[PDB]
Design a protein around this nucleic acid. Structure first.
Lengths: 51, 50, 124, 50
RNA sequence: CUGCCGAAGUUUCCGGAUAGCAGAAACUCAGAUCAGUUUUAUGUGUAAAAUGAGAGUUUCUAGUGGGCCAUUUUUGGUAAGCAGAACUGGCGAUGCGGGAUGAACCGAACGUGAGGUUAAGGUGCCGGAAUGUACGCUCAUCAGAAAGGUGUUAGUUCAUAUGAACUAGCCCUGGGCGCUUAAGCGUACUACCCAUACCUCACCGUCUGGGUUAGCUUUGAGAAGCUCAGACGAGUAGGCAGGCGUGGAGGUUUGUGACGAAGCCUUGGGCGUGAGCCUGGGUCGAACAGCCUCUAGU
RNA sequence: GUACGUGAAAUUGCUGAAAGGGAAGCAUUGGAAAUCAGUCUUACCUGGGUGAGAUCAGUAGUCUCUCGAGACUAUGCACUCUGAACCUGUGGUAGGUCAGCAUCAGUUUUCGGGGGCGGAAAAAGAAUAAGGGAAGGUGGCUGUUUAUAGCCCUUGUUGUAAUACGUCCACUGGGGACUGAGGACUGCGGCUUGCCAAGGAUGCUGACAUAAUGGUUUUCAAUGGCCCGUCUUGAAACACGGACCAAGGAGUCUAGCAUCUAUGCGAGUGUUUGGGUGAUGAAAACCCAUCCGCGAAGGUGGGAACGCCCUUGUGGCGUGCACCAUCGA
């Protein structure tokens, strides 16, 4: 049993053996283009652009 | 944390360096701690569980 | 499982080339300050268990057969069922008379003879 | 195991989102937020046995 | 001949008995204790959390029972160095890469191999690797790898664009070939070179943990067998184990031999990590051998 | 061929070979010359014909065993069989070495593409309506303030700009090298019983073989390597011993003691002083009389092993070895 060591990352079939989730990931997600609320304190900028 | 356990994560089964290439190995040793697969092993390590 | 050897060259004794009273048979140098025993660069090697060959290939001739020494024609008969792994080596003192009896019997048996052409001569 | 993987990924992504949102708010109203101290490090030996 | 384990190198009393280290056996426990460990806290010690490892006994028996170097610690020193005690490591039992070479310096500690990448150190040539990029400094007419200077470099400060006093660097004075806005120095960032080291695999062995019989047509019961898994591999003194070889002895091969024994030589072919072995050819001419045990002027 | 069995090494002479700038020497890697290793399509299967034989006869006898199992002797060659011999096939498949590509797997090194989230939600910048300002000053005239160049700063400014940086992708597309350990079947997964990149390499081909791949020898080329043993010394330095070859050559034999293990017997144990005996070496073996030697002179708990269970497991209830604690004697 386990004659060879097959890399879960390199081999997609061993990944399915270890990761019964890799079938459904969709890692990339659009969490932008929704009127991005530029967040920066004005006094934070004042102390940033000092000295 | 994920990549080290996948590519280089070897168990300690009967004081032997047994590779973790199947989910049955972890649960045979860590079944008592509700760890039953590699994802749980990562979660027990990354989140530092009990 | 092919016949692969970890080393070809023999292990000669240290300083065995310089002297003639010193035999080429490997003798472990026990000299207290012996740098060649101390494994320095430019020295010779030394037999180690790390040099052993594959256990499924030890005693195997380069063609895959293991030599088996047959004295008489009785011995060549028992290689009936290992002809694919053993080769009937004919002993050095077996006379040319029984030497043909061994080769003709072994040819029909199907086994391989290693020194089948010694002391004999063919005639057509 | 598959469902436990769902919860773990959701927990990880929520934790990252919370930390990013925590810093954005502090930067927005000017207060300074210190992130929580990590509990896990990975040690690598670099010097031999001599 | 190979394989495994492998110190001590010295306390302490006193030539020794101890001890210690290493083993070898017998025990009892891992739900029990520990640690050249670290914390917590009570008053640096002590006591009670983490990190790891199973831990503790009794018996009997080899070897050692020096030092050198380095670190440090001090005391005095004493021309000056230094000396004197200690302190702790390394070598010593230990090879390899680097340091031009060089036992003490920088790396790294060793089965046989294939690939990969590195450490220290290096990339002008010898020399494997950029005559890399950016920025300065160095001019030596001995470079380079206490001071002075009509010596510079950058300058600072103070005086009124010029001087003085200064700040500091460097030069001058007091491994080879070569290198000179370097192939020198100094900083930074890329890229590359390579170790007996690190990774992945193969193989040999060692130890450890298994599996295996109403021996199931997977046949793999020399159970002293076959099979599976993992880690490991320096070595003196020394301890343990398995083997190879010589003469002869009882058994055996219904063994070999004038169609050529034993021996001998030979750049013939093989086998074994090795001690050793088997064989071809040439000489040779009367004996000899494999196996299980016995034995020694081995 | 009487310098007479075999005729080794040192050592010397001749010849052939290569090599030969103050050594040689060996080790790795090859090359070259010289030389050996080993070569094999051939057999298998199938088809028919031809003659056969026999372990076959809708067959007959003997022999040794235990009905039938062998060895045979007649007789026929069918019924099968002998892939049996030949003709018939010109049918079908073709044993090692070495290179080639492919689809894969493990270990990798190297170029890419596409994207997510994060950072002053980069900063910038362009774009962008102004104002102000000074400049190293355009125009006007060194001084000057947008002109007959404009710039900078400040807002304003599109916006959620984009880039970069940092990080992730169970996103993807190529290049190259080194490995094939294992040998039915399991397992674990995915696709959909089957199939697969999932418990380790298999295909397509060629050439060589009737030489290639190989090995050995001398030599050369590049990299290397201070004489061995002893003793000394941390270490060396050393000082010793070594002209070369062959043969000889050094923990042995014995009594005593203790230890460990193996064997036989076991409150026993030991024939070999001696006697009996031994026809085939008879100094062996085999047998035992009288001594003699050496031995011989209770409770408590922890415990190995086992049983009963019984909420089982957990544990309890026990029985308790060796032994250790305890009280004991």
């Amino acid at each position: 049993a386990h004659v060879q060591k097959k890399n879960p990352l390199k081999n997609k079939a061993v990944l399915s053996r270890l990761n019964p989730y890799a079938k459904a990931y969709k890692a990339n997600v659009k969490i932008n283009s929704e009127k991005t609320p530029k967040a920066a304190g004005e006094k934070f900028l004042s102390v940033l652009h000092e000295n | 944390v994920r990549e080290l356990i996948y590519k280089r994560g070897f168990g300690k089964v009967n004081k032997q360096r047994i590779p973790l290439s199947d989910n049955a190995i972890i649960e045979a040793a860590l079944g008592k701690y509700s760890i039953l697969s590699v994802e749980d092993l990562i979660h027990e390590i990354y989140t530092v569980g009990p | 499982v092919n016949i692969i050897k970890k080393r070809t060259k023999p292990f000669k004794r240290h300083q065995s080339d310089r002297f003639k009273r010193v035999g080429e048979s490997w003798r472990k140098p026990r000299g207290i300050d012996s740098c060649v025993r101390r494994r320095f660069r430019g020295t010779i090697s030394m037999p180690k268990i790390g040099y052993g060959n594959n256990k499924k290939t030890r005693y195997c001739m380069p063609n895959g057969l293991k030599a088996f020494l047959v004295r008489n024609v009785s011995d060549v008969e028992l290689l009936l069922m290992h002809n694919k792994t053993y080769a009937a080596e004919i002993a050095g003192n077996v006379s040319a008379r029984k030497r043909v009896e061994i080769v003709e019997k072994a040819r029909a048996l199907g086994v391989k003879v290693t020194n089948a052409g010694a002391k004999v001569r063919s005639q057509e | 195991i598959a469902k436990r993987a769902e919860a773990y990924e959701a927990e990880y992504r929520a934790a990252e989102r919370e930390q990013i949102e925590l810093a954005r708010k502090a930067r927005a109203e000017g207060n300074y937020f210190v992130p929580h101290e990590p509990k896990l490090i990975f040690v690598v030996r670099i010097r031999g046995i001599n």
